RNA sequence: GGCCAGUCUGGCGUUUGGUGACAGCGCCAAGUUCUUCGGAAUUGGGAAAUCCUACUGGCC
């Protein structure tokens, strides 16, 4: 399954390993860009090979709706999506 | 299995760079070489290669 915009991931490789992040842009089949709105904010999002992430079965509608209407997402909305995701699991 | 590119002594920490193995930075250790004894250089294996072990990324 292709990675989705607004989907939560767990980082499995790299120095940001074992953290949770949000997919904010899909380059192709291989590469995405992730950001958490805190230590890794949108304006310097982290490029990632999708093989170095673990797809979590959770997609935040707030993140993907904001990209559909404004073409962007705020760091506060990213922090909200991750904070809400952790509270349900 | 083939072709190409890359990484290297170990432990803890890390808002930094890298897709990544890793690296950078702080601290504690280890090996090798040199020393005027104050220190200095260096770090997978190999005498060395377009070589090889392990690991990472790409194409098949």
Which residue segments constitute the domains of chain A, with CATH numbers given?
A: 7-88 (2.30.30.30)
Strand B: list positions under 7 Å from protein Cβ: 14-23, 56-59
DSSP A45: P
Strands, E assignment, A1-89: 7-11, 20-26, 31-35, 46-49, 53-59
| CA to C1' distance (Å), from A15 to B22 | 10
| Cβ burial, residue A2 (10 Å; 0-12/13-18/19+) | exposed
Which residues, other chains included, contact A27 with Cβ-Cβ below 8 Å and sequence gap of 6+? Answer: A33, A47
Reading across the β-sheet that carries A53-59, which strands appear in turn? A46-49, A31-35, A20-26, A7-11, A53-59
| CA to C1' distance (Å), from A80 to B1 | 49
Q: How was this structure determined?
A: X-ray
| Closest to A74 (Cα-Cα) out of A43, A53, A49, A47 | A43
Q: Which residues have CB atoms below 7 Å from chain B, the nucleic strand? A: A 13-17, 30-31, 39-40, 44, 46-49, 51-52
End-to-end CA distance of chain A: 22
């Amino acid at each position: 399954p292709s990675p989705e915009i607004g989907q939560i991931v767990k980082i499995v490789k790299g120095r940001d390993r074992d953290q949770f992040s949000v997919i904010i842009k899909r380059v192709d089949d291989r590469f995405v860009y992730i950001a958490d709105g805190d230590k890794r904010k949108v304006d310097r999002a982290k490029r990632k090979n999708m093989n170095h992430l673990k797809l979590i079965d959770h997609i935040s509608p707030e993140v993907r709706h904001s990209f559909e209407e404004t073409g962007k997402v705020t760091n506060g909305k990213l922090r909200f999506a991750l904070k809400k995701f952790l509270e349900e699991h």
